[model samples]
Target: ITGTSTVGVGRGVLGDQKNINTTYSTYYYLQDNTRGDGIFTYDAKYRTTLPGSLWADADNQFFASYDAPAVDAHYYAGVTYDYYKNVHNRLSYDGNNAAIRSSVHYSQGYNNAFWNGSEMVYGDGDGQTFIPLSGGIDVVAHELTHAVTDYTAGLIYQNESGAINEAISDIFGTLVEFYANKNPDWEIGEDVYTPGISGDSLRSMSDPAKYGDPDHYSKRYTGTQDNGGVHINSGIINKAAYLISQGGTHYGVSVVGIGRDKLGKIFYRALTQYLTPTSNFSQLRAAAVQSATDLYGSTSQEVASVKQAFDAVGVK
Candidate 1:
């Protein structure tokens, strides 16, 4: 959302726009060794949702637009920061004090909020098309998580690696959502969109079958949409991750899930300790399974379930 530099998909620091054309650096400005999230600062009050940038311009209309960008950004940043720190035992992105920057009222009528490597950016919805992107913490959490994926596995944005990458975002995004609340239901975009569209949420983890798709991978699973339909095709891995996570209310797999606590730990371990930049389908499964064994021992039921869940996704 931040108009800094338009990188493809991974949410990281945006390079200076002029520089994106000249230097073609592998990383953005904030990704450099110098920046941190504290660069964006404000007091504990909000007469305006955004202080600097275009939001301060009342004449622009998006400022007084009552987007609630700061409210959601503050809540999401704090919550996600805590999730990475406490649960994964890792610092911010890059394992250091990476500054979390955010901008609201991005582009006129843009329909998405994204972490463009440096900070989170929100957009005013296209009015009739969609609501403001900042409407949901889960979506904010989801975008910031692309930053996490970039830092961790850096999973290839194609084939099975891309599927795992997308699934990771959904899994951790839900974790952060629930982390923000003890009773967070498994929903995606309710906070930002018009509620008139029933079942219009981005994706469903508990019951992919409940949505307009097949319960499992089918011949109908075609690679379309951006990132190889990483959103839709990822239902398999998303379902697997959800099944592995035991907490919350879910009814699949017959047996009670390992609960979100263990599931989160295992996934975090896999992402941080096991997977790599070029890791593929088999590697993703192996990392997670090894992470489970490492955390709960080889004989742990959790370890076995780790394998079983991926197997359910046809990962083996």
Candidate 2:
């Protein structure tokens, strides 16, 4: 739709008021032309189809209860885009300023949000397990980071490679959360996990075992479920990344905290440069080590910390 770029006031799923970029063409549509090519959001209408109708509002004000998810989805997509461009010097997920798209209200009682390899899709949860998932900035960043992985690393979605993919998303997701400086923590999906239960999250990077996820290679799940325990085994890598960012000792192994910015730099370099589609856990450790060496130096603390982080996680 061709219309002048406009700003619209809206309340997100968490009732936080924010201004969203919209286009006023006959009707106000959720199309933001500010970042990259553009960021567009759609209404899935609780159906399975993707990127449904472009969200349209008679007025530019989006305060309706149904508009909450779309508001957050559109707003957070812009935030994620900013994080990548400003922090990593990368354009969009494709590094070519590809247009970002998202659809909300995807199926009734849907409990998850994902990047369908093309665009983002969010589920308005059943309200028990979750509210609208787009309410969580980390959740939004997590899905968008999947797009980043798809374009850069292209890690295979199974086995150790899959676990690396999942951990990469969680790592950057938390980084983006910290970048936004909004109640940042090493937790994932805490903002929208469960309204009934407070102080809980879908996963934890600082302590992956808190959610029954393995934080060490010895405990890695090898079952056939979950694509060879892709999500389950990601705990190991998540714990390693956590250790790299925030120093800690595990099983008598200690790591020196190199801070978040360096953690992101090392991992980003590894993901964009050394990692391949079938790279496994050992390969990932090698990539991170080389990345740190390239960025800092072989004798730099960054390189030593990368080694210690992987060693503490028993990645070898």
Model-by-model lDDT, in order?
A: 0.61, 0.95
Candidate topping TM-score = 2
Lowest summed lDDT across 10 adjacent residues in model 1 is found at: 14-23
Candidate 2 per-residue lDDT, tens place, 1-316, comes to 7899999999999999999999998999999999999999999999998879999999999999999999999999999999999999999999999999999999999999999989999999999999999999999999999999999989999999999999999999999999999899999999999999999999999999999999999999989999999989999999999999899998899999999999999999999999999999999999999999999989999999999999998989
Instruction: Point out where model 2 deviates above 4 Å.
Output: none
TM-score, cand. 2? 0.99
TM-score of each predicted structure versus truth: 0.75, 0.99
Query: Tens digits of per-residue lDDT for model 1 on 1-316?
Result: 2324221211111111111100013322211121334334222132224433422211211122352454445445656777888887767777886776567666677777766655667776676546666556677778778888898778877766787787788788888888878337565665566545654576777766555543355422565556666666667777777777752233333433698889889888888888887777678778888988888999988887776676565667
Task: Using lDDT, give the best candidate's number.
Answer: 2
C-alpha lDDT of candidate 1 relative to the true structure: 0.61
Candidate 2 yields a Cα-based lDDT of 0.95
